[PDB]
């Protein structure tokens, strides 16, 4: 039913099939060994992404879309890539990089004083990390609508990977009132613009790498908590901006405030905030 691809296909005997990833969160992941993807006979750790039981024709149309989309993006250090497919003779498997350690959320709480504590330049390079892989994805056009800590993934080289940017999400069926698996609100995410008008744009994601910043030097933090959505719109209509986290220079928090500047246009690019962040990363100790 599906079209070969010869660039990216694997046979399906080279996949040794592992522990459930997401817990169901992520869509159905598992954790997975290779054999011989460059080098045949060593095996690599890899995530495999594939439909539910009980997934409907556009279930199989979006994660076609997306495994399309990683395709056409190409690769870079700081995003989850792309690493193969099993299209033939079975359910579609989509093939990425694994993160050891989880997401960026996770791995912050998990390292926060009462496993090892992070340095300041643990932190600021974390940032850097990530506002790499935006830029990177910026350059190839591609707008992520949902950048937060709980989709950056930590590999266990401590690499940030960007996850998620190709996912196909119809904006004018978001159900503002779901929450995370933690607990949280992904409104408290959005650009006001993207919140209250529906329009996604680069711009959108760099206000969501402020709220992003926020949670790095909150060591994982929730944004705004105990408010429910209708009191996060009148907090936005009345320009309301997070508070200063304890333990963050002026200068980084300017930086946070400068992404959510009230005018889109105004906002640093993310080729801006990665200069910026490449300075504050050699001078910080
Ligand atoms: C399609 N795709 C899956 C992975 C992938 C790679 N390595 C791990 C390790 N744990 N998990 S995870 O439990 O499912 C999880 C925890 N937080 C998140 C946020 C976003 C996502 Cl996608 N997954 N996730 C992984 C997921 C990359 N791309």
């Known amino acids: 039913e599906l079209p070969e691809d010869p660039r990216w296909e694997l046979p399906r005997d080279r996949l040794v099939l592992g522990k459930p990833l997401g817990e169901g969160a992520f869509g159905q992941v598992v954790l997975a060994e290779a054999i011989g993807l460059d080098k045949p006979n060593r095996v690599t750790k890899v995530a495999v992404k594939m439909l539910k039981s009980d997934a409907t024709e556009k279930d199989l149309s979006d994660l076609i879309s997306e495994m399309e989309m990683m395709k056409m993006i190409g690769k870079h250090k700081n995003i989850i890539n792309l690493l193969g497919a099993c299209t033939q003779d079975g359910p579609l498997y989509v093939i990425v990089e694994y993160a050891s350690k989880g997401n960026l959320r996770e791995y912050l709480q998990a390292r926060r004083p009462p496993e090892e504590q992070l340095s300041s330049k643990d932190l600021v390079s974390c940032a850097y990390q990530v506002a790499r892989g935006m830029e990177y994805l910026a350059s190839k056009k591609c707008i992520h609508r949902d950048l937060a ?6 590999t266990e080289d401590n690499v940030m990977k960007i996850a998620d940017f190709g996912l196909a999400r119809d904006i004018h069926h978001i159900d503002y009132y779901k929450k995370t698996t933690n607990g949280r609100l992904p409104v ?3 650009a006001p613009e993207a919140l209250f008008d529906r329009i996604y744009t680069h711009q959108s994601d760099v ?23 209708e009191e996060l719109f009148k ?12 333990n963050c220079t002026n200068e980084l928090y300017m930086m946070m405030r400068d992404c959510w500047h009230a005018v889109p246009s105004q906002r640093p690019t993310f080729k801006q905030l990665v200069e910026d962040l490449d300075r504050i990363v050699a001078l910080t100790s």
């Open 188 to 190: 408290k995410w959005m």
């Open 207 to 229: 206000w969501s790498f402020g709220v992003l910043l926020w949670e790095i030097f909150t060591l994982g933090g929730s944004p705004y908590p105990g408010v429910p959505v």
């Open 149 to 154: 800590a709980r989709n950056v993934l930590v």
């Open 235 to 246: 907090l936005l209509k009345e320009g309301h901006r997070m508070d200063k986290p304890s």
